[PDB]
């Protein structure tokens, strides 16, 4: 993808945001991979929207890209697991443990074992190393702090965290410039559409 094409995506990102096409904005961020919206990410983490959190992340990194991303996905999936235990849904917890958390066992067996063991506790805060889990809201917040640090230090995100400074409606301004250019070609000069060049017979 060109540097032109990349800048065009940013212009479109601005336009979509100004038009309040919110889901479209974040899909473009994700699919282009050009910009990671930390504000959006914090919002989805605070809301515990783990499926979207991972889907969004997938546009930027895979679990085994490097140690930062591994810990990012591990922390997220661990929190998802802990929340399942907290609502006393052990069936879902085991599902999470096997589907989502097992990939980390290779990289740390004893950690995966200790997390597995939480399944059999009446309240998983009985484990002194898991006794620091407060409630869901605080747990998400303290983890989000770590997630932000990890993402900001993750080399895969290094030029993707700050939106370019642009004047508002930059794409619309360029479009208007296009229409000026088209009209400037006419003689004798007296707009139907953006779809075809304008003309004055």
């Amino acid at each position: 993808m060109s540097s032109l094409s990349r800048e065009l995506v940013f212009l479109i990102l601005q336009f979509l945001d100004e038009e309040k096409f919110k889901e479209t904005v974040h899909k473009l961020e994700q699919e282009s991979g050009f910009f990671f919206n930390m504000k959006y990410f914090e919002e989805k983490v605070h809301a515990g929207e783990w499926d979207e959190v991972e889907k969004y992340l997938s546009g930027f990194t895979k679990v085994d890209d490097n140690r930062y991303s591994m810990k990012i996905f591990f922390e997220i999936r661990k929190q998802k697991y802990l929340e399942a235990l907290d609502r006393h849904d052990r069936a879902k917890a085991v599902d999470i443990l096997v589907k989502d958390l097992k990939v980390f066992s290779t990289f740390n067996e004893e950690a995966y074992k200790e997390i597995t063991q939480l399944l059999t506790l009446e309240n998983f805060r009985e484990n002194e190393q898991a006794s620091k889990y407060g409630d869901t809201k605080s747990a998400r917040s303290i983890m989000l702090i770590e997630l932000k640090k990890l993402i900001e230090a993750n080399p895969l995100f290094r030029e993707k965290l700050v939106f370019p400074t642009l004047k508002a409606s930059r794409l619309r301004t360029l479009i208007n410039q296009s229409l000026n250019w088209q009209h400037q070609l006419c003689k004798n000069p007296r707009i139907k559409t953006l779809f075809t060049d304008h003309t004055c017979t």
Binding site: Y68, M70, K71, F107, N108, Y112, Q129, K149, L150
Partner: peptide, 7 residues
């Protein structure tokens, strides 16, 4: 504990 840490 699956843990890289950072500064």
């Amino acid at each position: 504990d699956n843990l890289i840490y950072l500064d």
